[PDB]
Amino acid sequence: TGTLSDIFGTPQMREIWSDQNRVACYLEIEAALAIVQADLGIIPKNAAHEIVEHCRVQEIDWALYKQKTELIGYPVLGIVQQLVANCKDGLGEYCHWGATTQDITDTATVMQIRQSLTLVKQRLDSIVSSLEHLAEQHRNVPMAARSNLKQAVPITFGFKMARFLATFRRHQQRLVELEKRVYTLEFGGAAGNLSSLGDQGIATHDALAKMLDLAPAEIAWHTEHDRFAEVGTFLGLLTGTLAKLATDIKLMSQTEVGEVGEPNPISCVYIHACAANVRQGAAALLDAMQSDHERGTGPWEIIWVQLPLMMNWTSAALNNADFVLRGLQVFPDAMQHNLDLSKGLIVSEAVMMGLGNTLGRQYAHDAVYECCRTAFVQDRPLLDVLLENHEIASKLDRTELEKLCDPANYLGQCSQWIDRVLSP
Amino acid sequence: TGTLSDIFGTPQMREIWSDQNRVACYLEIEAALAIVQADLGIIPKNAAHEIVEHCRVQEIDWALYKQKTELIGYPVLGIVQQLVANCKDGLGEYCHWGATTQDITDTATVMQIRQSLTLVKQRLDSIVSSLEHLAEQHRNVPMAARSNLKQAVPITFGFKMARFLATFRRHQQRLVELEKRVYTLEFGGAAGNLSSLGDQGIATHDALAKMLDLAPAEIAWHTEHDRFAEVGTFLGLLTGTLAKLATDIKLMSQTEVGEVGEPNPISCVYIHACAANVRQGAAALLDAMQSDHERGTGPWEIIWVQLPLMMNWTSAALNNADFVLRGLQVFPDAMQHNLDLSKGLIVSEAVMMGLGNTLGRQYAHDAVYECCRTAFVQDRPLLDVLLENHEIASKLDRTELEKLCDPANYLGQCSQWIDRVLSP
Amino acid sequence: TGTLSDIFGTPQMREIWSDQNRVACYLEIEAALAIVQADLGIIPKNAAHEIVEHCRVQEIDWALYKQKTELIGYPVLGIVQQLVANCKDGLGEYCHWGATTQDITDTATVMQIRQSLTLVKQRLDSIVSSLEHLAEQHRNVPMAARSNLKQAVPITFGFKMARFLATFRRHQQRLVELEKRVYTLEFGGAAGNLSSLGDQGIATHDALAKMLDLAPAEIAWHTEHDRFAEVGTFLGLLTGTLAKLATDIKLMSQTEVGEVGEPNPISCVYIHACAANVRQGAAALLDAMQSDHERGTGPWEIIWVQLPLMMNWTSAALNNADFVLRGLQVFPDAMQHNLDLSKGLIVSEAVMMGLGNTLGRQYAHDAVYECCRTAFVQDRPLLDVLLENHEIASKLDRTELEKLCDPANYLGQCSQWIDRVLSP
Amino acid sequence: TGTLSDIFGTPQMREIWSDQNRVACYLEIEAALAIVQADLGIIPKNAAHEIVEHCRVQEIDWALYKQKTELIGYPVLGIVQQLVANCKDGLGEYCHWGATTQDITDTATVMQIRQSLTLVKQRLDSIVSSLEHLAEQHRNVPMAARSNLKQAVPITFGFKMARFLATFRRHQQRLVELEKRVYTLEFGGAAGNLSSLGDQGIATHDALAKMLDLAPAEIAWHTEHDRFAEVGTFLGLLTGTLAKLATDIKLMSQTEVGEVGEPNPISCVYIHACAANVRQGAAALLDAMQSDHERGTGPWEIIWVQLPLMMNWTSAALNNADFVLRGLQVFPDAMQHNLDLSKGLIVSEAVMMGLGNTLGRQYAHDAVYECCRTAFVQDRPLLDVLLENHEIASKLDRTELEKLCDPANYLGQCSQWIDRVLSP
Secondary structure (H helix, E strand, C coil), X not given: CCCCCCCCCCHHHHHHHCHHHHHHHHHHHHHXXXXXXXXXXXXXXXXXXXXXXXXXXXHCCHHHHHHHHHHHCCCCHHHHHHHHHHCCCCHHHHCCCCCXXXXXXXXXXXXXXXXXXXHHHHHHHHHHHHHHHHHHHCCCCEEEEEECCEEEEEEEHHHHHHHHHHHHHHHHHHHHHHHHHHCECCCCCCCCCCHHHHHXXXXXXXXXXXXXXXXXXXCCCCCCCHHHHHHHHHHHHHHHHHHHHHHHHXXXXXXXXXXXXXXXXXXXXXXXXXXXXXXXXXXXXXXXXXXXXXECCCHHHHHHXXXXXXXXXXXXXXXXXXXXXXXXXXXXXHHHHHHCCCCCXXXXXXXXXXXXXXXXXXXXXXXXXHHHHHHXXXXXXXXXXXXXXXXXXXXXXXXXXXXXXXHHHCCCCHHHHHHHHHCC | CCCCCXXXXXXXXXXXXXXXXXXXXXXXXXXXXXXXXXXXXXXXXXXXXXXXXXXXXXXXXXXXXXXXXHXXXXXXXXXXXXXXXXXXXXXXXXXXXXXXXXXXXXHHHHHHHHHHHHHHHHHHHHHHHHHHHXXXXXXXXXXXXXXXXXXXXXXXXXXXXXXXXXXXHHHHHHHHXXXXXXXXXXXXXXXXXXXXXXXXXXXXXXXXXXXXXXXXXXXXXXXXXXXXXXXXXXXXXXXXXXXXXXXXXXXXXXXXXXXXXXXXXXXXXXXXHHHHHHHHHHHHHHHHCCCCCCECCCHHHHHHHHHHHXXXXXXXXXXXXXXXXXXXXXXXXXXXXXXXXXXXXXXXXXHHHHHHHHHCHHHHHHHHXXXXXXXXXXXXXXXXXXXXXXXXXXXXXXXXXHHHCCHHHCCCCHHHHHHHHHCC | CCCCCCCCCCHHHHHHHCHHHHHHXXXXXXXXXXXXXXXXXXXXXXXXXXXXXXXCHHHCCHHHHHHHHHHHCCXXXXXXXXXXXXXXXXXXXXXXXXXXXXXXXXXXXXXXHHHHHHHHHHHHHHHHHHHHHHHHHCCCCEEEEEECCEEEEEEEHHHHHHHXXXXXXXXXXXXXHHHHHHCECCCCCCXXXXXXXXXXXHHHHHHXXXXXXXXXXXXXXXXXXXXXXXXXXXXXXXXXXXXXXXXXXXXXXXXXXXXXXXXXXXXXXHHHHHXXXXXXXXXXXXXXXXXXCCECCCHHHHHHHHHHHHHHHHHHHHHHHHHHHHCCEECHHHHHHHHCCCCCHHHHHHHHHHXXXXXXXXXXXXXXXHHHHHHHHHCCCHHHHHHCCHHHHCCCCHHHHHHHCCHHHCCCCHHHHHHHHHCC | CCCCCCCCCCHHHHHHHCHHHHHHXXXXXXXXXXXXXXXXXXXXXXXXXXXXXXXXXXXXXXXXXXXXXXXXXXXXXXXXXXXXXXCCCCHHHHCCCCXXXXXXXXXXXXXXXXXXXXXXXXXXXXXXXXXXXXXXXXXXXXXXXXXXXXXXXXXXXXXXXXXXXXXXXXXXXXHHHHHHHHCXXXXXXXXXXXHHHHHHHHHHHHHHHHHCCCECCCCCCCXXXXXXXXXXXXXXXXXXXXXXHHHHHHHHCCCCCCCEECCCCHHHHXXXXXXXXXXXXXXXXXXXXXXXXXXXXXXXXXXXXXXXXXXXXXXXXXXXXXXXXXXXXXXXXXXXXXXXXXXXXXHHHHHHHHHHHHHCHHHHHHHHHHXXXXXXXXXXXXXXXXXXXXXXXXXXXXXXXXXXXXHHHCCCCHHHHHHXXXXX
């Protein structure tokens, strides 16, 4: 394949959305339709048997199919033409009975989405497993939290990972919830009412849905693209979180920080570009919801292009995030070094709390604040400046004071918050 | 307030996102926080009573708050400063205890979203009610379905409305599902671990959630923006369907079509522009999910701008669609006139089927197909061309053939599909 | 190659952005670099001769290049490695001298853009030629102008085409203007300062620019992506106009309108989807301008994905519009029929003016206004309602009033406006 | 005003796009139209004098105007109504003569864009001036360049600033080029052909353009939105560069880097959010180019909302970037400290070059590479490891060797590249 096809895509996701799997879905739908309609007495029983026997992607002439599609303008009837020609005894004229091409394309797209989300669920399960392990392994490793890219107060690396873990669990819930809407048959014919099937239209629809393990539709949805668009916005939300992970890991991999390492942050690079492309594709799928009347004049076709791209981009981002988290290098010594840069300023709030009991909470804040900025101007440890304050030094000895100035003693309830995420 | 403020926004939704309601939310949070911490014994109970007494938006100096916000850079501490100054006996120094400003903004944004979605749910119930009425009222009103802006086969106007109705019901389900994730407290302090509250952080968080009728958070989510972004993508999905409705109504009110009328399609005009703005805002909120570390350096602030805009645009789109659907003018005579334009071509498939027993399946298809092409090129009724087929004219009188060429006799199961959207 | 590859892309544009042309550009750059540095005395002249001799894309092992690119992470050094191995006597070790991989990718992307814009300019010249012919051919063909999808006043079809023509001429000017910025060499090395070339960096850069027929760069632009992004926004602007053309043509070919025909509006369908995808890609390229420091950690790679996609989508949109405009079917009789739909209401303003001298300015307005409303509600010709105004019928015979109610007599200066777009 | 109105907007840009300035533009256009048409003999000379005297924004009833606009649906005729009522002797009936409301809104928008770009040009001039000073002041200050957020080789801070300077100069060229297209009159009447003005339509148009200091239009452009959309894409490109500047400054302001300081990087925070909102707004303006027929049914109205927002967001981003660059704090000692982190590895390429003359260039690379990774594993200076190599140590003494290991001696032609940018 192409040089970059497996860098911004993956083999597995490329296969699902390939021409071969797409047509294979078409053929399974035509097969299930023939079987259903024979059982209902709509078409003769030979014909179903002969049609099903020729619903094999290996018999397709791809070059002719491309020609016919460019020249019909839509991608299904070129396959129906070869199916009729490969059946004997004129029995092929009973295939595609009452269908329109968008019944086949919509339902095939549903089938490909289900295959795609199987891969996504597996990657998510693996990512969640890695984050559960990392939150526990590094539960007590202290590090500087950062607000506006400036050090704030200490936290633990496990706490950081538990926050990603909780987010991906919410994405897992979103996925399961949309599946019950998305895994739905589309079978409505030219205008949605299956007019050519008369009083057998709904009966055919419901039987076909059961054959394909899909929910029956309430009504036709050929220009009602909320199911596909919702898949796209979910991909946007998920890669949004993947892009945050890539951002934080690449920030922690700067030469001047050195707190983690990928197993150059190339995986983070690919995640970032993939997420950027997916979010704009989501806007395009929202745009496509403007499909006019009973078959959209353009909007529908946006989905043909964007959905396979977005799925491929997302699988590549998921692949890279899974790989990084599963072999992530963590460097507690660099984390400790960065905690010590401010020479105590990062835990001034811990000094205020300890001294608040003897001097008053508000007064302790103001007193320690003055010591902080004094320590900043002179580039000296806060401990040295605190000890030069009789009001402070008369109420806390050195042993207590370097304890309060030790960044590793101001972790708050990080461990209990981690337990709250791990327990469910 | 402004010339266009109630055209691309609404009074109710503008009030929700105004500075006054935003700060009013801030004060309710600070009040509830003081009460909770007084109950836990963290601050004196008389201090809480004085703080709560001064948690009134009418006491705020707006110009001073504006100035301080521009100097500080963030919108909460200007309000905490006035609360501290307005309380007696220095008791205001116990407010905002252990909080960071993004605890207040995130939780206030949650409360404003709940208020917004109450309005959205009301609009949705009303739109759904109108469409149920329209689907039943016009259940049997025939019209031409349109594919690629060309007439396809006949349907009924009620069928068309039932297809919108089924979609809005899916949007209602999406709304309910995201509410359980979105209606969640944010109280985590500077780095998420509430370090300044020691062993009282989790207790304070959970009690505050109950006081505000919000779910307790698993863990802090200051840079985990999936709850806000998912609100944005839902607004994108909903306004996508609103934009289709606007498209189909303005197409049906073209001078050359005239099948419906607004109660110039000016409401459809506003809906179109609102949806376009909302879909791009959703991409920006997905972009904002890239918030670094424990407080984002820029991405977070995207949400401050986009969320009130998208809420306002969405409420204006909903208002116009609600208004249009409640007084929609329907013109069945124009509908019938347009059905008669093709002079039978629109039901050629019904003619093929009706003739299959008399002519043979193959000839019926081929004869009607060729006769259709003649009638189109010559601009004559299909019936007249069929009668000039001696084989056809020898077996079917004009009366029987006239029934097959009548578009009102080829509606399929439109009524039963309507029942499927309504009756369950 | 793929079923849809020539429907949402084109053979010529796919070739330009293929791996083979991309690498072929790489080799031409390495060849020109060796020659320049041999001329400057940096590398031996026999080494350059051997490098140039092996700068042939036919000698590349594509599967190995694919593997190495996936291991290295970037797409150039896999080609430099095979060039070094294919040269004799270790003379290949003088290639890529002082270059970084983004020098090769940026400059190759520039060359591929120049090839792409050659195709774009050809399509633009052909579209402009077709519109000049259509504006002149149909200069006097009357039709209804439409505002908010409602008939407004009469215009001519040539006037409508002259308005598209004027727009594409503005797009041609934008194209020419950006070419002088975009056709620029990138050769700056790892950090932009060509440190490894010492006092020969600028000399090498400027000589290489001449060898490739590119402008010398002011300074390195590895993270300064305005040249590539401006190509993307231009494609957005151009496909925006193409999307309007597709909209107006598919509206005029509605069954109820029938004023034009494609030579189903299938080309308009593809144009619509291509433009929607291109406009979102432009936002992604603007996003990519956020490239950090001297080599971007993610944003840069957005360009690798989006630019070939947008180029391909744009070429397919241009191909379809070029094809449609060159064989557009125009139906003046349908145009006249639609002009006659309102039975005179569309030229009520001409009636007011014609009557002003006879009735007085004020009464002419008021009388014609009220008569219009009667004719609309009663679905009768305006002329008949005017004649039932005794004051009007006493001063103007039917013949004079019939001329004022004739839409073909109220065309204004359509022809002179056409001359303004054509004659200059 | 609102709490955040001057944080994500500016006073000056809010004024330009306010209701008051918008209507003031409307009134000037109606005044110029009256004067022009009196000179042409189209309307009587009193009337022009009386109309002009009442073209004053102070006489407008804003509450009535809001009511009429919501209820007409478009924003001009409410102003024409008050103008007619404020003129004596029925002379107001000659205003707005032959105009449609979009002539007034389009032309007013052009006038507001010209006012807006005056502010943008001033900010750009000030930013370019700051960057010229910084490139010269810090021409020789060494620092680490960074690729993929990892240290690459040394450059100077002045070199970094010269790269921004060259980019903003290209943005200045883009601005000047679009001005000649954008500063154009829109005066075409209901359908673009000014039918109600007969053979005086073009004459009125050209005279009005001269009166307003605007270019005459080739033809009407009511649904041809490339001029407005092009303003939006330029804003996207410019804020793209502003967002890169904010990114690099906030990265250099991390606690662990400390190389620059703003005069928390709050200005960088606002720039980032503003740029993110502008890029999506650009996609919406591209979307709006799909305006149907002679007056768009929705797309046109997108521009009413997005353009003032994008202008305001851009002015706030420009304001912050201007302020930061004009008082930027630069810390060469921190820059030198970060250059020394790798203990010589960052200038290993300088050692390869110096040693290449005695050992051969290729062999020198391989030899120094081995010393580099040895130095990395043992966390020792490259100099110490190099001196432990007889082949290397026999050809370069220590004095030469710590010179080559000194990061401040490997700047390449940074100074000459700066001169190349400053010289024009």
